[PDB]
Amino acid sequence: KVFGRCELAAAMKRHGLDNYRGYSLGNWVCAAKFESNFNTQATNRNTDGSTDYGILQINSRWWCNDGRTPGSRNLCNIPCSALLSSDITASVNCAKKIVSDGNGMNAWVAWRNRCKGTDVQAWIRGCRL
Ligand SMILES: [Cl-]
Ligand SMILES: [Mn+2]
Ligand SMILES: [Mn+2]
């Protein structure tokens, strides 16, 4: 599914991401834009042989099992294919475990390089929420 900006913001707020671990909703919308361009089906293969999956580009080395990443830890206890669904529940639930891991949203390199320190409330401007 390719979400619209406000449609994704509403879905994220429904699933309890607004101010989750102190990160306002615009942070999450910004991270999704630059990681997947709001496309639940996005996949990208990394140099280490792992793959990133879905709207928040969750990694197969640590977080989900794709059956081709040796030594995967599968800390979210899910097949990575679950993260490509039009229903964002599985991605949100796994993202909450990632942001809680000690480094906050710095776990998403696009967030650190493109959203951190910017006016992230712009990402939710104009939306009915
Ligand atoms: Cl933090
Ligand atoms: Mn990425
Ligand atoms: Mn990557």
Side-chain angles (χ1 to χ4, degrees):
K1 188 168 155 182
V2 184
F3 276 85
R5 176 179 61 88
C6 295
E7 183 189 20
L8 179 65
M12 288 177 158
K13 186 153 174 306
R14 185 161 92 73
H15 283 95
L17 283 187
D18 194 10
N19 310 310
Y20 190 82
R21 301 299 279 235
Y23 292 94
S24 66
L25 191 61
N27 285 284
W28 299 95
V29 174
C30 185
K33 169 67 178 185
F34 298 120
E35 287 289 1
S36 66
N37 207 18
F38 301 148
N39 179 11
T40 67
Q41 302 193 70
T43 63
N44 289 107
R45 190 100 185 243
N46 303 303
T47 63
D48 71 356
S50 76
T51 303
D52 294 339
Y53 294 88
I55 200 142
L56 285 166
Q57 292 287 273
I58 294 175
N59 193 260
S60 71
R61 184 160 304 287
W62 304 89
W63 307 103
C64 59
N65 173 225
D66 65 4
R68 69 170 195 195
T69 308
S72 183
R73 309 197 75 203
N74 198 8
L75 290 167
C76 292
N77 287 117
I78 43 157
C80 296
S81 63
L83 302 176
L84 302 184
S85 185
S86 55
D87 181 326
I88 71 168
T89 303
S91 291
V92 173
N93 285 344
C94 188
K96 286 175 175 172
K97 287 168 187 142
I98 298 171
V99 74
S100 296
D101 212 37
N103 304 316
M105 287 193 76
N106 295 294
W108 287 277
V109 174
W111 178 86
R112 182 174 34 90
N113 291 325
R114 306 180 75 176
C115 301
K116 186 181 188 180
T118 71
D119 179 30
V120 297
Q121 41 258 255
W123 289 98
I124 65 157
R125 202 157 293 148
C127 304
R128 221 179 271 126
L129 309 177

